[model samples]
Target: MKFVTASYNVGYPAYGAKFLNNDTLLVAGGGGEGNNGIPNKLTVLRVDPTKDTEKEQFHILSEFALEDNDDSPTAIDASKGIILVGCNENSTKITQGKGNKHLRKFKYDKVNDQLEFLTSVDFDASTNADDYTKLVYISREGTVAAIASSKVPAIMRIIDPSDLTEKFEIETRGEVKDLHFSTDGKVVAYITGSSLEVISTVTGSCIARKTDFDKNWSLSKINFIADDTVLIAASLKKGKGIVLTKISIKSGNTSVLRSKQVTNRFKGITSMDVDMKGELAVLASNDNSIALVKLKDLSMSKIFKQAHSFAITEVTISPDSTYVASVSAANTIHIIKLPLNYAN
Candidate 1:
């Protein structure tokens, strides 16, 4: 299968990206607090699949800039027209013990190219400037949202997306590496340190935990392809390599469905996502490339080497699985179109 690639500069180092629709992309990032030249902003771009030229393939649709002192958006997820963003307050306000409103909600008007601020909440109560929201996930149905922090006493909060009010609060053992909600939005899974845990959104309790996936591997990314199944990416604890594993959760027990090493080149999986159909998975790595893996057996299908000039920060597949978008701190985004007969 042939892949058509197009690249665009989003005006700042990007850390989060997602498809608002089959043809529109949302990217978030910026240079944190100071006149360092790069400004904190979130931009929406229109992608033209028929255009092969880099400059003609994409155009900016709309953009929203944050205060100069506010931290750049670190995590982002969207469903329908609502968007969830993770950005911390200024350091001075945080040092004064004033809570950091790190979690924000916005409504995007696709027809008019406008972004409206809806609400925000402080998911982390810490006064330390080092603490910030590391991950944000929105359920497929747009009913719930989850946010995680990056420091010790790691915090995870489940909230009602309508107003960003806490519905369930969880404190994991260590910093959360990744978080995802089941397709039905009834369960959520997260990986921290070396363990994987699934929680019930209805009861706010741990329903499953796998602490022994491997002794020498550390989990870095997790995505739920089904209610009882998830794909995890890990790296060798003391060496250079990356592996993808599929785990099934049933009757309070977790079992390996399949596992395979994707690479052995001193790289870590930075982000991952599975399409709505669960037939394929896409992963971004610190080696400045992205890989496509078949979900049925955890086998590598294709690899886009040097897809970016710098380490990739995020990668996502369109809901229909026709397009893949990857971003990096190098201030560029690449869009790839999968061949029409890719599944064959």
Candidate 2:
């Protein structure tokens, strides 16, 4: 588990990135004066980490405007020619002033390398509202969602991109910190300040849940390890400083699979992602570190300290598992060619 790294400047305040296939990476970022007056946008690039030629290293494919790319890349998701971008604002302005909110979608024309604005829905919040909307993502199940913080009962909904239709609402206890829909599109996982749960998106039912997992949760990252278990990154005082924890998706099975009894120096888990193989996982931390881990034994293979100049926001692996990409608040994106054994 190693990497040979490279970086590209797609936008300042890099929010998130996703692989459209084995050869393409779609990046999202926050608003700046140069990118219109909106709060966010999406960028596409064709990358071949293994290539030695300068012209073939990475190519800019397209750029799409967002309704809100405020905090991080958590506002967008892309797949199957559809993109979902969610915005949280304190006022009802579409793209100006403060307190603006919008859920926007675009149709991607891969053949022409273009993005066409389809439709958008807006949410109104007052300037004093701190916990209005959190993150927006489009699931493979064809469901688009925008999540609200617990301040408003943490409402969730499945939205229609074609016409901004409200498909249904998902009810929650507190503010949602993270979200992940099952690969099969049957169950939805949302995280609160101290607990996590799996709900049936079809029946709108709570299938399973666990609480008190982390008392000092800072909007931790999550993913489905397999069909039965969920993985999360958080800070534990006595357990590891900041580490990964595995929880069963089944009911009444509140147990951690590893490192819950140990101690480490890592401060926090900022972002996380798994490759196409599912045998390896990468974690970015608030302490300015990136790590590679084996899933079976959950052992650390390598860690790159000071991997980024600033705090990292998100991470993604190429579909071929040849490279791992990390985006930071400093508006820089790093692409590391993998299996380099270049770890510290």
Candidate 3:
């Protein structure tokens, strides 16, 4: 147990960021403004962690710029050298493979081993694009999900990875602010405004109950702890934050696993990635704070999480959970590291 902190300058928008395998990180570059609020381009940053820390890991950049302009999708996936990026009008006016807004899967040949485009998809129009939409997790089960924000409606589209086809669509009542899934691939969850929903693995139907937290009380992030628990942040006064709790599998029941009010001030958590055993939860919160919580007992302690003066929208641990990466690239490339196997 030691905590390490590093700061850097972000060259572009990191609204949608994720770890591509264990050695690299890929993020959408359309976070800023363009013509009439449209994004100039949807660029991808491929960072090799083997050379540096978060602040300056050194990046090999690639981009997809549309003539009509468009908004990058809220969701992104980088697995098996394939990058799945989504966006809408805000990302660009191209629409689908044609429209600026659409879901396209790319192969990372240039940066990695000549990653190329495997296939692209346009699930539909309503999901085409908007302000804060995001594509969440694409499971080993061959499913991809994305969030459609703004007045467009909040929902997740399950798609087949093999052929780039549509599966089923899961709808939420409120606005989609963030998305998450369980390590077991049995559950998929998404947050709309202040409420949360959990879907059953067998039926793919959302449980009858919905999670409603304080609307004004901004939550920085949410992390699923193994097969049963989720670690989320709740804002409290006095310059402190809290990691609240709820069960992963919902029976329309409440939970009791709440953490103490932590002393760091944060914006809201945008993303989190779990390790292999699902024993420890590494969370990326607002203000560049990475918190590690013990899932077995929901205790917060141990490791080098930080509170840098920046807005880091996401965090991911290696599949093995040995290395943790944070993205708030306001600096060179902000990043921090922690120890391993503490839980086992």
Candidate 4:
């Protein structure tokens, strides 16, 4: 298949990327607290779809640099002009026994092309210097934020995005590989390597838990396709294929709609994101490839091999589902325009 693509260097090892708007893109990364010359920063880029291959398609709009000692932003999500990032402060503050300010909130000022910091909260209470926030998700309505850490004794904190007030803290079995809020913003779902749980945002209670899938397969990523249905990406631990499972939760009972192997690549899926309409999903693999899948039938529509030189750290579809963006440790971001009929 023919593809229209644009690439740019963010000047740091990028770990997180998201489309802030139709024309605005946000990329975050840095050289950790090692005192390297690379600075921790967030960059906003303007994507000009009208430009062709010969012209410059991406223009830097603004940048927000963090202190050199702070850890790089590992996860990011945005809603209603509010941006939430998962980054930990320096090791000195983390080892002080108080807490690490890991969950940061910002507002994107479109008119001024700036990322204005609003507030920050300590989501992880670990005194271990190695522990850091690894996952972050913001609701579509921008009411709630969920943040998770990287190590065991895994804790997930749900907080109010406006004032950074704690609402609930959930301790899970293992590291949370992925988490996402339902389209309606009423329920949230997360998957550990061995389990999947759907929790209600209103009552802060478990809605449904499923642990009966193939025991050898590791659940890596998850997304809510409907109020009662979700799509999960699983990979075989001892084999060479990636499986996409469609599960339905109703009245406390869980049923599998369809479970199919979408790719035979040796590497598993590292990151994934579904469009707002739930019509398309993007999957990034460690083999430096990205696959576009049809959510309706769990079919692989197109696969872009060697999308980047290094493993893709994150992948996201635009709010309007017109484009797909991905970042890597290669210090680069790639934006690709989807075919007009690809989503259909």
Cα lDDT for residue 127, model 1?
92
Candidate 2 residue pairs in clash (backbone atoms < 3 Å): 15-73, 16-73, 89-99, 89-100, 90-99, 91-99, 149-175, 150-174, 150-175
lDDT of 1 at 133: 84
- Candidate 3 lDDT tens digits, 88-166: 5543343233443356776655534444556665555553333443554566444544434354465666665556666
lDDT of 4 by residue, 101-154 (tens): 788898889998888889888766778878877888889999987888888868
Q: Where does the lowest 10-residue lDDT sum fall in candidate 1?
A: 47-56
Residue by residue across 1-344, what tens digits does model 2's lDDT show?
33567666665577677777776777777753333454566777888656775346778888865444243334566656777765453333323445444566777678998878776655434354344445665656565444443355677775654466766677777667777766666777877757887787667777877776556554466777776667776666444575667777765455666644212767677778866455778888778788877777677777878777887877887767777888777777777777533221
Candidates in order have lDDT scores of 0.85, 0.66, 0.55, 0.86
Window of ten residues with lowest summed lDDT in model 4: 48-57
- Residue 94, model 4, lDDT: 85
Best by TM-score: 4
The runs of at least 3 residues in candidate 3 whose Cα sits more than 4 Å from the true structure, single-residue gaps closed, are: 1-10, 31-74, 89-98, 109-112, 124-132, 144-146, 208-220, 236-240, 246-264, 296-299, 302-309, 329-332, 342-344
The TM-scores of all predictions, comma-separated, are: 0.95, 0.81, 0.74, 0.96
Candidate 1 Cα misplacement greater than 4 A, ranges: none
Indicate whether candidate 1 or candidate 4 has the larger lDDT.
4
